[PDB]
Design a protein around this ligand. Structure first.
Ligand SMILES: CC(C)(C)NC(=O)N[C@H](C(=O)N1C[C@H]2[C@@H]([C@H]1C(=O)N[C@H](C=O)C[C@@H]1CCNC1=O)C2(C)C)C(C)(C)C
Ligand SMILES: CC(C)(C)NC(=O)N[C@H](C(=O)N1C[C@H]2[C@@H]([C@H]1C(=O)N[C@H](C=O)C[C@@H]1CCNC1=O)C2(C)C)C(C)(C)C
Lengths: 305, 305
């Protein structure tokens, strides 16, 4: 028993982290087979980043201009191209530590682990959620760009995020591994506004199931509700609508506990309308929405990789 | 910016995890050089664990009785001995992935990362703190024993914990890597009581510094206090005493922010006596005590490994 914000094992991704230096800028790259992926603003000076022309900055760079270091070993660059907001640097050496991998573009509400990195070396792991407004609440400093977010399924690392920039209130924004930003963002240093965030309702409900599984059941009431009635109440508290797809995905947790989703919706409706009255759920005084239904089953059943 | 519960990169420890099977019991072991370390209750049946005689159970086991599997590879056992509550199984093969390591016995209040494992395969990473009552708030299921807790310093993995058992209220207890339990616990299935836990004051104060560093400063008041006065107020709220050693360790954070420790103590005294009035600090509605002063500097400065 016990329930904690749990990240994936980071080993398979540590073997892929490298350092990319172009001019006076240094950030991290991802080495998979014979290609290094990194954010394109490595070819920028700080004066370029206010309004960069990446296509023009890149044509004045040669292969030798990119210093790529795997630990203490320099990887000779034998080719380069730009794809959206990432650079693909071809190297003369294939990474012998390349795991089975795929590039995935995730959905809002889904979760993944970030391997924070500086100068090609890992600093730590933490789990994140792609917010409905297409941002992530992460922990990034200067030099962390190129760090990636990922999920692991058995032996396959699905890479889903690469870090590019930070927005007001410790908010972070990045691209998938094809260089396309999550959300309405561009990689330049000028005023941009993220959308209004909202609470991932299916994740709150999945975390309430983790609470029941762990014996924290004080919030369960004797009521049920309709799906339309719940979504009407949830709307006032900035919760995303609950869909029948969400109900179906909660099925495994509902069947394991014998608590119908709509019954759990009835209890969450009371918590939102009445508050928690100074009590806590799984040690938290606030409702948590960065555990997907899959994460709860994985942690409560012990799925390994 | 941003601040999150961050775990160490788990790569170096994943290369050491193995599966140990004796009879019908299976748990994880730690493979370092030519020795596998694992909890001794692997030689127990469920009827033995109510009141086991480990010394007598072990003398009826041979080397061939221990099935040790590194992935899909069996490691031939060529020797065994018992040290306190762990078994040392000597194998004919040295682990080629053995990192630079040391066995450390940590202090209460200090933190470390747990690599939860099932059947020799990793399930996830999360960060923990050794509570003052010598327990940890972890996430463990049946078959997770043998999972280890650790810190990383540059290239050196300090192993500090191996998991053995769970106590009432999702509370977990284990040994150091020499088999000595943390706290007044024994590895048998009979009624044992953990001590009263208390709040790690130096860690709360270090987390308030992380809040200032991130721009969350609403709780800072215009007052100072004496160390004796603060410890008098903290005592009523089940906070551990603050020592001059704790003040000295907070020095780096105090100097970086220009907030004297005792000034920060004055603000924490107000938070404890007045509450938070529905506000949050670094996104939390409760004060956090599982960030050491070192962890805050590491995460806010980007220390890598
Ligand atoms: C106005 C708005 C809302 C657009 N924000 C904005 O200009 N932000 C800036 C930003 O993040 N930038 C500017 C420059 C790159 C990116 C950058 O420095 N990325 C770092 C990678 O190494 C990671 C960062 C460093 C701190 N924490 C992080 O996560 C870009 C090409 C966009 C900044 C003022 C925070 C520096
Ligand atoms: C009464 C008191 C307070 C002493 N508790 C107590 O008997 N606890 C028991 C316990 O944990 N035991 C019993 C047996 C070994 C240890 C065990 O099963 N360890 C697992 C490793 O594989 C990990 C566990 C499994 C669940 N979560 C975990 O963390 C021992 C030799 C002690 C139990 C009832 C929870 C099963």
């Amino acid at each position: 028993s016990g329930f904690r914000k749990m990240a994936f094992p980071s080993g398979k991704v540590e073997g892929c982290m490298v350092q990319v230096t172009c001019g006076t800028t240094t950030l991290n790259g991802l080495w998979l087979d014979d290609v290094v992926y990194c954010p394109r603003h490595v070819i920028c000076t700080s004066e370029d980043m206010l309004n960069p022309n990446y296509e023009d900055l890149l044509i004045r760079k040669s292969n030798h201009n990119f210093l790529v270091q795997a630990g203490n070993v320099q990887l000779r660059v034998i080719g380069h191209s730009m794809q959206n907001c990432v650079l693909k640097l071809k190297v003369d050496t294939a990474n012998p530590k390349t795991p089975k991998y795929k590039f995935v573009r995730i959905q809002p509400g889904q979760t993944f682990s970030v391997l924070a990195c500086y100068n090609g070396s890992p600093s730590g792991v933490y789990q994140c959620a792609m917010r409905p407004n297409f941002t992530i609440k992460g922990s990034f400093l200067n030099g962390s760009c190129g760090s990636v977010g990922f999920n692991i399924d058995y032996d396959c690392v699905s890479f889903c995020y690469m870090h590019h920039m930070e927005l007001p209130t410790g908010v972070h924004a990045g691209t998938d591994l094809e260089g396309n930003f999550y959300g309405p963002f561009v990689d330049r240093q000028t005023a941009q506004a993220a959308g209004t965030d909202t609470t991932i309702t299916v994740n709150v409900l999945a975390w309430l199931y983790a609470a029941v599984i762990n014996g924290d059941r004080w919030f369960l009431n004797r009521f049920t509700t309709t799906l339309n009635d719940f979504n009407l109440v949830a709307m006032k508290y900035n919760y995303e609508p609950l869909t029948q797809d969400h109900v179906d995905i909660l099925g495994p947790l509902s069947a394991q506990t014998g608590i119908a989703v709509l019954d759990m919706c009835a209890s969450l409706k009371e918590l939102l309308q009445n508050g928690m009255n100074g009590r806590t759920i799984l040690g938290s005084a606030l409702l948590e929405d960065e555990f997907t239904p899959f994460d709860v089953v994985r942690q409560c059943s012990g799925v390994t990789f």
